[PDB]
Design a binder for this molecule. Structure first.
Ligand SMILES: *CC(=O)Nc1ccc2c(Nc3ccccc3)ncnc2c1
Length: 274
């Protein structure tokens, strides 16, 4: 059924590799295979498999699909569909200025559609960032998690994640109430989405640049907000500003985000105003 082709990276419970899957009756496809490390503990086997149960609960075109889970043979495997263009952040950094605005709004509409599905089921992601968005050959963007351990680290002195009692926290992507009081809701994912919008419109620039993680929290509290990226339509920036309102009750819902993006797609002339 499954054959590993090449080790593409490492995960927190073992290795992550590219391979092939032969379904009985269906055509052979390229898949991503997660393996459990040799000499694993009772907790590690439970934690690795529980992450498959979370992913296995979702069926949507903009959410990474779980093909199957191997449990009979040791080491155990998690099998998901292959995403040829890899992580959205690196993909945009390599393809700088190569897409029209319509194509970028299309990428954003998919992420928003995927996040709307998650919000319906009262699922809070807690780590929505372009680094956790996977892209396929048809440029379809999918909300991911529990993937590669490695990620882009622009400056280890202002790391992407800061350790917290409950969990790791990505300062630049997290809502100020989430940072301050661990108030993680679908409204704090909306703040993260706004950050993702800015990542997509800037072709993978670092949110807040040179500013330290502490300077970000302070600037945000003093009502600073990221400026519009170069040649970004005003409507999109205004949408990012709605996502970044301090009052979390005024931020749009993911269904409202989808509707605004569909409205901009229906009237493409509106996207000329910069
Ligand atoms: C270029 C590159 O590294 N491409 C990748 C990386 C990761 C990945 C994954 N990750 C994943 C997420 C959750 C569970 C298991 C694996 N899936 C699909 N394609 C890729 C491509």
């Amino acid at each position: 059924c499954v054959k590993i082709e090449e080790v593409i990276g490492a995960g927190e419970f073992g290795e992550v590799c590219r391979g092939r899957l032969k379904q009985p009756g269906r055509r052979e496809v390229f898949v991503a295979i997660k393996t459990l490390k040799v000499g694993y503990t009772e907790r590690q086997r439970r934690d690795f498999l529980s992450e498959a149960s979370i992913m296995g609960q979702f069926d949507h075109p903009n959410i990474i699909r779980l093909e199957g889970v191997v449990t009979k043979s040791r080491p155990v495997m998690i099998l998901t569909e292959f995403m040829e263009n890899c992580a959205l952040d690196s993909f945009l950094r390599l393809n700088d200025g190569q897409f029209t605005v319509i194509q970028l709004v299309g990428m954003l509409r998919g992420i928003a559609a995927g996040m709307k599905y998650l919000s319906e089921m009262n699922y809070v992601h807690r780590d929505l960032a372009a680094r956790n968005i996977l892209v396929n050959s048809n440029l379809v963007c999918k909300v991911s998690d529990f993937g590669l351990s490695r990620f882009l680290e622009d400056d280890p002195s202002d790391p992407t994640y800061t350790s917290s009692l409950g969990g790791k926290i990505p300062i630049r992507w997290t809502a100020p109430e989430a940072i301050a009081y661990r108030k993680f809701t679908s409204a704090s994912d909306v703040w993260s989405y706004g950050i993702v919008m800015w990542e997509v419109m800037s072709y993978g620039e670092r949110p807040y640049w040179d500013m330290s993680n502490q300077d970000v929290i302070n600037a945000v509290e003093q009502d600073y907000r990221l400026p519009p990226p170069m040649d970004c339509p005003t409507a999109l920036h205004q949408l990012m500003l709605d996502c970044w309102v301090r009052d979390r009750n005024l931020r749009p819902k993911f269904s409202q985000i989808v509707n605004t993006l569909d409205k901009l797609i229906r009237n493409p002339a509106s996207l000329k105003v910069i």
